[PDB]
């Protein structure tokens, strides 16, 4: 005997069957997902951080003017200045035109702070997704691992179980991301040797200790000002600093489908998409599903704040009355609005907060809490102004 | 009793079971998908449109040397010259010993037409996918909603149904799109402050009414021409206009898997990918599936026009003979060619048009109509020439 | 009667049921996947290759100076050089005791070698995914095709089979790729008219025989050097050549989930993600699944070489003892490490090599071979240094 089924891939909402096998005492099977880990394969492209300008001591020369070649230094520059500031040794000896040539030069190197303050630009692709399912068969509790890259057969309670491959493997991570501290961003970060001044990627290197530093800060050598010889130049404030102010909110809180982002190994947790098929040694006869959901009534929607076209810029609040504290499912029956989370715990208190998203100022959608519906009407403000860069 | 099954996620091709429950009258269950809505979470990055050049009043100098600073306007440009020597003096105003001077300047602002003619660049990620399934149980017809972010239990006809989570949620939308009018494009549009002259994103601002206008039109101040003082300059014709001619065909007609694009709320409809699992209170004994497909013969393929390496640039036409007007499935058994639609209605007329795609000039694939096969042989022309920009 | 099930979408690991239909001789059903083809819809954006500089013969002129307009040529340039009149050579060339003029010009065109040595930049999106399943019903062997864009009903052995739509359609290809020879890369290649000098896309054209050549090699006209008239200029070595050295490893060996890349028609094979649901005319009573996996013990992990943050830069080697040569499944129970392949053949020899990936120098994960586990401890070196471009 082999009975096949399929449970939802959502952490929380359980599967509860009432296995009444003709012999005696009836078993109460119950398996639910408790975790979901989708780790991508980060392929570090490069890292960027505040830069540091470096200008060595200048070469004071006479009319015996020199000409600077070109070395291999990040954004390296050099300019021979003909005819600069009246001062001299001996009694103005040079002579031969120009009066005084100046060999000014300066290049770039990543700030001494990169080590403990830099962002990373990885190229990630979903590598594997596994989930932990806790099955409570009668008087036995066991946790099984389920993947996408293959099924998994296990024997629990003297019964054979086979948790077929997860239907799909959805990822909230794009193919190009940027990891800063504990934050993760989905940015189409400029390629390696393609950074632009005053913008993310101002300077670029494979790693902090790397030796392939690339920069493009628009370092421009200026002509010396009479008085005390020094090296004047124009640049463009650390794009990295600029990015810090620009870069919006992280994925950490904009992840769809209730997906939760984490940073150390970098992964998406409890992402709610799909189903997990199972099968056992029992006739579809002994099987009988149980569906006991918290009955709720007097639903009421109330939108506090809401922002126009921005990943979940709205905030809905549902008031209600329940008969039993539990865990309900939330949905939107209007394509004009989308819900971030896909579930919410229902407490007898009567307060549920959800984040929604829409691109229509003044939208009118209908949210749902289990089997109850309610309308939401709100007026949203357009997205914040950007932070204009060096104009 | 709980019997589990799974129907295809394609609008049209139905599921038909013959439930012969030993009791009396045999029931004829039939459930099929009728719609599919996958809405993404657009996160407006910026919008662009035809720009408008602006030139302030020219600083008609004379006996002075007014120098210019750096205003905060969009891509400000200021240059001061020493000419305009047609004459124009008089002496009573400028009895100077030195020659003339003139400070010309200009900046940019989005054309007065952006309001009702601009494109938008959103950053979208699949937010939710739901489908409408019409189940016709015996003498009862009911429509149920099914999602990915959770299952859904419903009671219909005194029988309990549970439409498990949709297998997967495929999206034809990339992570960076551009919405123009009723069209949608998959473009890796340049980032915010990174627009280039004569190219899409010439100018950029969060919103039309925004106040963070960014531009890079390569505005260059030219030296005045003797005669009537004015402000000469070089620029680069509105990249936006250029984009209009460049930007190929929209996704609206290149969407794979028969997916249909829509614009107001922005979503993909009837996308045909996946399956929808269900379960009821009935033994696998009373259940018996029915599969009555239109039998077709004398299949014949004929390729009219075909373009090389371009999203569905070919057009196949199948002639045939059917026994009953119905709805068949179309497939390609040769990796060298791919079919856009995944289904086609079979009329007794005998004419079916399909769009195919391949990257091989002179390909030889085998299309299929239900259970019938036929070969297709055609010779394709390479893709159209691009529209070279300001050379 | 209709019994539903679901088998894993992995080429190799089979499905084996023991159909004991009360009548007589027991049938041994066994169906397993043998291939998987996911072809995308490449939409050729443009191709690039080594460029060729072109400077025609110069126009030796007198003080009767000419002025060069502007033609339509790739990166076309021209500059009228005043008093650059090389001066002297034989007879009389411009007696005007002032200055003559030099009309120098040069443009670009793709090297004569593009035809048989160029890369291609396509814009690809999953078009269709089909799999070949070999079902061995009793004393009959038949191969059925299964897709995502629809189900498929077939009759084999006098029994009706319906292979529902594949759960999902995962693709290792991004939305922007580059095909070179037999290699495929996932590169966010610069758009059409947006190429940069000394970088991939130096020059760009829809096709090799195209007539929309675009270039941006930073061609700069230099002033002639006294002696033998010629045309001096500065450029930037073929970005294409640079790309050749830069472009890391191809997808061909970094494809996740054991996916295998191919080049002629361009597709991903045996990608191991998902499940394939089936159903027949038999009670869940006659059905009984069989799971006979090779029992292995004395597992031992040994990491040879390992590279930091790079798509599968590590190499694990498992030693062991088996009871029967077979085919096991490999997994990682530590989010800090991911396995490339999702299966491995188990020979009595005792040697299994796997590629893993992690972003943590000095990681400690636990790999698995069927039902056996083992720890892996290794220390990895950071990613190679990039290849700094024209500094
Ligand atoms: C099979 O799994 C069942 C359910 O597993 C759930 O586990 C949780 C943690 C989540 O993962 C869920 O998603 C899983 O479904 C097991 O049944 C559970 O059994 C435990 C204990 O009986 C229940 O947990 C308790 O719930 C009560 C509420 O009734 C809490 O008050 C209680 O809090 C504390 O727990 C710690 C343990 O870390 C105690 O040290 C602490 O003192 C306190 O316990 C309470 O102590 C006070 C005295 O101060 C006493 O008055 C309370 O009676 C005592 N509470 C109890 C009953 O523990 C804790 O969270 C859990 O609710 C049950 N699940 C349900 C709702 O069915 C089952 O045991 C597993 N089978 C086996 C044996 O493996
Ligand atoms: C369920 O849907 C069917 C359509 O498939 C409805 O049947 C239609 O009935 C009307 C009048 O009896 C006819 O004009 C149509 O041709 C029928 N369609 C077909 C093909 O059956 C049926 O009424 C619905 N069930 C309900 C709500 O009673
Ligand atoms: Br890149
Ligand atoms: Br962007
Ligand atoms: Br592009
Ligand atoms: Ho500025
Ligand atoms: Ho990009
Ligand atoms: Ho041009
Ligand atoms: Ho260089």
Author numbering:
A (entry chain A), B (entry chain C), C (entry chain B): 1 to 391
Paper text:
CHIKV, like all alphaviruses, is a membrane-enveloped, single-stranded, positive-sense RNA virus with an 11.8 kb genome. The E1 glycoprotein contains the hydrophobic fusion loop (FL) and mediates membrane fusion. Contrary to class-I fusion systems, CHIKV achieves membrane apposition by protrusion of extended E1-glycoprotein homotrimers into the target membrane.
Using sub-tomogram averaging, we elucidate features of the low pH-exposed virion, nucleocapsid and full-length E1-glycoprotein’s post-fusion structure. In the timepoints where membrane fusion has been completed and the intact NCs have been released into the liposome lumen, distinct protein densities decorate the exterior of fused liposomes. These protein subunits originate at the virus-liposome fusion interface and are distributed across the entire fused liposome. From top-down views of fused liposome surfaces in our tomograms, the protein subunits appear trimeric. Fitting the E1 ectodomain crystal structure into the density map shows that insertion of the E1 trimer into the outer membrane leaflet is only mediated by its FL without embedding additional regions of the ectodomain. Moreover, no extra density is left to accommodate the E2 protein.
